[PDB]
Design a protein around this ligand. Sequence first.
Ligand SMILES: CC(C)=CCC/C(C)=C/CC/C(C)=C/[C@@H]1[C@@H](COP(=O)(O)OP(=O)(O)O)[C@]1(C)CC/C=C(\C)CCC=C(C)C
Ligand SMILES: [Mg+2]
Ligand SMILES: [Mg+2]
Length: 335
Amino acid sequence: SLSSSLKTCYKYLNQTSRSFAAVIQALDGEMRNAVCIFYLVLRALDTLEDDMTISVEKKVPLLHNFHSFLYQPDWRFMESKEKDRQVLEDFPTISLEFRNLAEKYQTVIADICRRMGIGMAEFLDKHVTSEQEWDKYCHYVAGLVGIGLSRLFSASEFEDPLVGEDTERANSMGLFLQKTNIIRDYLEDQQGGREFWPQEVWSRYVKKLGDFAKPENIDLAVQCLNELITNALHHIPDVITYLSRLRNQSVFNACAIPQVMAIATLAACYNNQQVFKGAVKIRKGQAVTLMMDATNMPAVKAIIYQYMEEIYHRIPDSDPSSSKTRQIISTIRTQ
Ligand SMILES: CC(C)=CCC/C(C)=C/CC/C(C)=C/[C@@H]1[C@@H](COP(=O)(O)OP(=O)(O)O)[C@]1(C)CC/C=C(\C)CCC=C(C)C
Ligand SMILES: [Mg+2]
Ligand SMILES: [Mg+2]
């Protein structure tokens, strides 16, 4: 039986992660613990970042120094008003299990914590302006998770060194998941005072981002939605390349499921007014079918092409992104 501290870590994983708990807990051998802890560490970091009761000036050191707290066995944070605060109040349990991991895993995890902290700190006194800056934000909060996971898979030796070495491909995997979430969660974020859509894009349509929540502005909102989805789709060639290299079945499933869930969510969101009224989600019955079929590369490719064709045939004649949307979809189909 596992140590009591590790049991506690898996308890926190199941409490806090809806999307990832199952796939993580199905990982083979040494990957399971490495990735459970990687998750919890980053989830604590995020809980700090998310917390708007922590002033910027106080938040900046906490984010910068977070990587170092992993080696301070009594470090915890008692001022969080976030839902996942337990992760911060009992951080010593998480950091004890982290220090129990092989050095080769510790190094990757701490390195990712350090870099994500710097990047999170950088976006505390600005929003996202350009599409380039959108890519940068997404790299800090998601791309680096992909790079982190990739390097862990390689360190365990269940996967070839190439998986951990190709940082662009791993970065794209994270970007695709993150843009999908940001696109889909427009309203939830607007209601909580958060703004993640790029300013240089939305500003061509409305004067304030929240203006897309107003019913009179729906035609413009959906145009902006379509332009941002088109942006996200450009990461799919790299997604296909990344998944095409994976050898371990448990690692294949962990990587592929969230990607095909995000592909399904993007297609559900395309040209969809409902994004501006509430949370658009793929039906649970369909989610089950995707989890079952996405176990090999050719079946993943089929799912991708299927959802691309769904989008393609829903492009409105007058959509200002239409030519771009067709172009990227073709690229995906022919690769
Ligand atoms: C092992 C496995 C699939 C995942 C474990 C992921 C770990 C360590 C996360 C710790 C930090 C977190 C929480 C980040 C945020 C995820 C929120 O989505 P959500 O749906 O709200 O999930 P949940 O229900 O938990 O809230 C996010 C946007 C990052 C997405 C980018 C990834 C995952 C890299 C993909 C790239 C490759 C796989 C190359
Ligand atoms: Mg968060
Ligand atoms: Mg956050």
